[model samples]
Target: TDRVSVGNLRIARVLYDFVNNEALPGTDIDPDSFWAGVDKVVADLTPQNQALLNARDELQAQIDKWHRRRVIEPIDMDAYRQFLTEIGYLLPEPDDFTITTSGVDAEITTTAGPQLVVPVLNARFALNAANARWGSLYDALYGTDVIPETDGAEKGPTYNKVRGDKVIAYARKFLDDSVPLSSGSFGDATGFTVQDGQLVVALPDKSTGLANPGQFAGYTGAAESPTSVLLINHGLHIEILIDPESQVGTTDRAGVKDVILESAITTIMDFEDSVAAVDAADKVLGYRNWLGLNKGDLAAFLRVLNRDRNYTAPGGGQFTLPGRSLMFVRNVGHLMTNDAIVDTDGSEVFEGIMDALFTGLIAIHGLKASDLINSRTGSIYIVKPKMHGPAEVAFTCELFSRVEDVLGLPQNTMKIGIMDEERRTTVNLKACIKAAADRVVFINTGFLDRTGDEIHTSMEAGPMVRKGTMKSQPWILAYEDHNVDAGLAAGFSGRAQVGKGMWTMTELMADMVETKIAQPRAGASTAWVPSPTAATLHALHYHQVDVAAVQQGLAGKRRATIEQLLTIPLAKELAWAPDEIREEVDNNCQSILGYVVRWVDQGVGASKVPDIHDVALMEDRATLRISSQLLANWLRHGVITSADVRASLERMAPLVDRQNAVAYRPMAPNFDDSIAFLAAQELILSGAQQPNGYTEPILHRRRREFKARAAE
Candidate 1:
């Protein structure tokens, strides 16, 4: 083993090489000193990380006993709440406070638009995500389901005039509603001009100005004949690209080629659930990608950070805009460990601690760069997912502080994004936010993991409602409201972000356009989108509603309460029909078998997995956790028999094999010999006690085993 021995840790060769050769250049910290400092940070944080995880295990045990002993009768909501309070599961909320997080980029506080989460390993995709600061609405609409592909309106390799006209009209309606003209509509305008400061629109017969003349930010080219006009509404920017030589521009009376919306206001470079990282080799590649990103020129292919856009100011001077999405680096939770660094006592380092230090060091490049590429202000956003409660939140705050100290940055330089997913965190969200109030930049509800934790916390409460209608439950809706309320209660309205979850269907744009508007309406400053095109499409939702106004409307009182959140979605005396049981088991099995096979066998962590009906879903470990947790809850309640689950698992194994069988090892005939198949079944079979319904540890263990076996 090529291990480089530091003072307190033995670093893996690849990781050590990356730190010395790639990660150490052009920064304040030197090679040996950085390694020694990493050693110190890991050692100091190890005890606290483990202790917090132990607290999580202890709380889970108490919850299981409480649910098992008490739910036999009426659930006695008051008694359940009191019991949680007694066991320290529910912490007392600190007095009302506002987040004092400073130095946050405009994307997090000033703008409301789409947020993208990309796995760290996808270098090219990561580049695209950062470049998603601006998106072509025309391109997004022409290739997507947003424009109905009916008859001649269908999308084709060649340009379709019917579809182009529809796309143009949709954009026109969008501008008419968001950036309206003072008189008449953009549809009737023949051309655009910017004189002095006001945007002038020339109609076929006459001329007019913007309904809100103040919205005109700047222009490109000449005021008399501008190449593109820039406008800002609701803190987000739009560019009207004017070029008659362009294909789409020649067809329009206004000579407009496309509209560019400031899409993906922010991006989270994820190193946790979205990745299949286990060892040094797997991790170093991601570290290199990150290292490249911070240097402002990542080239997993050919790329560099986008150059800032320069334009003429409306009245005078010059106006410029950031050319890239404001990015946040999401570190892992404290559940797993990696062999990237080893202790003198022959143990691996906690992955979360490793991430905090390594990523913090990497970001110093961006912080010290002559030209700011990522965060304009001197702040680093690290989203910490799956922390249990206020205690875990405190641990990360301290962890960030320690990392900042070693890195020689000021306190609160690292901002924490709390994921209101776990039951403890959701119930005690206000307290969690309060602990990080000085540095918390984002908080969001993740339904997939949230549901898993919901079931695990109340496994003995009886059968849960079908996964089909899980979100319809009072607990979930209340959970959603609670996140917004907690954020607003702490004055997150304009200073920080209140984000919603991802739209899992990458192929369904029309459905997203029709539905995702509810996020901004629900007072969310941002929400997740799957791809760059989706980011462009989702940005329209921000333009349709004023997030600040919506947030103000709901700020009078907390919309949902702790009592409603404690209400478990348990089915009453539920008896599944033979058909219902079969289909439910089959559906869960298909998702588990399908997504897990790739993770464990092919080393693909996140994929667009096909459902039983062939619609591909953007899936990750969270999807696996939700499916397996429901199956385990059912098994625990006898809603489905073991034989029923077993049969479905076996059947779905072959079905999943066939779906990706072009170059796969079939699991049907030799199911027992398949590590992936067995792991998938174990996920359901032992789901009730799988460490709070987390799928990461199992996937990591099996993924390592598969790689080791394949090597032999």
Candidate 2:
């Protein structure tokens, strides 16, 4: 079969045109040699790619057979472990080893702060995420419940003075603790001025400076009346925005308006898990936007107030540091395949292969640029999710090698971020790190997907605990512990990132501020935040925990054992009443339908979908994956009848509509002929047939079909 070609074997003619005509005109490499390099690399590596995938299927098939037989016979944990070891699902524990990965940025390897994950498909969203490296701490508090809303002080459209006062008091308290005054509080200060290289706050009795005057990093505007004052605490920067004429500032004694925290030190430009790119066109668009980001030329026209307004990456604001947060592109996992490139046998190429080659190729524009850009160290960071074990990790490393060869780049140019979400990976995390030792830059835990895979992998073992109960399960603790322990043992400290998953409840920042500090203390240098404001609130955790010190202390601890990690959270007894079971099913069904309706019918890749009790949880493809897998597992075990499942979905549809009342217009009402609603019903009934329980193919096809019909 003739391989499709543009300049340098890329898919897009326009991209090729730009690369060859504009990007590569002054470079030494010729166009023809590049394409030949790609062809040779693809030919050499395609078979190896197929072998890894074949190995996965083979392992899954054996596991399925073992579990199928165990349905009748009671599960013996020891016997199950032996079987897994015999079949190579569990690898022999490796000797103690440490990672030698290098050239990581300080934000990833050393800095402790919030990380943001945004869909790369939307340019505006990507730009916002990049810019979210800094956010207002005052806004984060004033807008949320960090201050208690009470006594008619509830947040409404109109400003509440009581709430505003609470917000100001809270901000001042944070300032006092974070950047303390030598003799007085910011609450009592009547004016602020820089004198003798110190921030002097004028009070009724006297003036005072910061207890540690050097904490001040920079300032904007005149020395007499600086518009904003920037300070550094534990390497994280914060800004004190002052506007004497502004509404909030005028009411303040010191004219302090806002405290902007440097947040989202790094962001994942996600193409997998969070996105719904189900076809060639969607994938291409996503890749192109990612390419733009790498080249530092990503721009978009956002309509503000009904006018075409353009936005670019901010090049150092009045009182802020320049440059965007370091970007990492997350590629798809190894399981699925795409129709973008068909083989001679009419089979689609593995989606992971496409991602590796295409995303790497697109990154060449950044690599070849004259100015040192993108990764200052000349590395392409790709976060690869859902690998089962060390073999998959090795396979991904090999895949990245092939991709580098295809693009005529240096070895280890693409760094791997291993997502330790799967049970196999979690159990053998140290080994997984060793597999990608030179290239591994990140190892993170995603609990939601991890829990779902836990249930699915041990479906025949027994009934599982409720979704909420699984969080407290011993397995979860072991999993989280092992990820950080393995990373530190592998010498990730000051070399690569050891990250934690998102704060799923975005609206509950008050809760986040109280609880999120645990991640950094647990030896994670970074954690995911849902939005910019959330990132601001989460950044405070980094200040609370010196993560490097934590990791250093953790070095002496024993690695979390594989036995504990493999312990499935199966129910000891089916102790729930009929009403309890119904409530659980209703909750799961309602959440699933709420997310699926928009995904299938309206092509919304991500949104905050309200759970059963109206608390919205951030929902994406990963959420769908978990929900569908759980429903399927329950159905297969006879935990819920088919009729009961159907009735639950039907009842949940209208409830989903009510939750989505604030969404964009043309949303399909459940009772008014919604194909998405029907698709959600079909997803559950047909989930067993879908490959690996992925909802993309069905959701994407339906969404495309809906678009075609709407075109008429």
lDDT of 1 by residue, 1-712 (tens): 6898888788898888887887778776766667778888887888888888888888888878777665455688888899999999998988888889999887888688899999988888888898888899999999899998999898787999999999999999999999998888999878988776778999888899988988888989988999999998999999999999899999998999999999988999988878888998988888888777777868654566687899898885796898888889988988888887888888988999999988888887777673355776889889999988998999999999988887778999999989988999999999999989899999999888898898888887888888777867999999998899999989998799999998998999999999999889999999999899999999999899999899999986777888999999888674567787787788888988988988898877788877766777888988889899999999898788889888888988877877885447777879889999988988988888788999977888888988899999
Question: Candidate 2, which segments miss by more than 4 Å at Cα?
Answer: 1-31, 68-75, 301-320, 365-372, 658-675, 688-692, 700-712
For every candidate in turn, the CA RMSD to the true structure comes to: 1.7, 4.6
| Residue-level lDDT tens digits of model 2 in 1-712 | 2245632232434434544554444435567775565446556666776777677667667777787776654467788789999988888878888787767667777777888999888788887887787777767887887877778778889878788888888878877778888987877878776765567778899988889987877677666777877778877877788897988888888888888788988889988877777666677678778766766666784411111112111122333253467778899887776656554556666788778876777666655552325576778888998888898899898888876765667899899988988887887777899999999989999887787778767765566777777888989998999888888878888889899988888788889899989899898989998888888899888877778788888886975676778777866666678897788788888878888777766666887887877787988877777777777777887788998887888788766766665433333443446667767776777766565566766776666666676679
TM agreement with the true structure for every prediction: 0.97, 0.89
Pick by TM-score: which candidate is best? 1
After superposition, the stretches of candidate 1 with alpha carbons farther than 4 Å from their true spots are 661-663
Candidate 1: TM-score? 0.97
Candidate 1 global CA lDDT score: 0.87
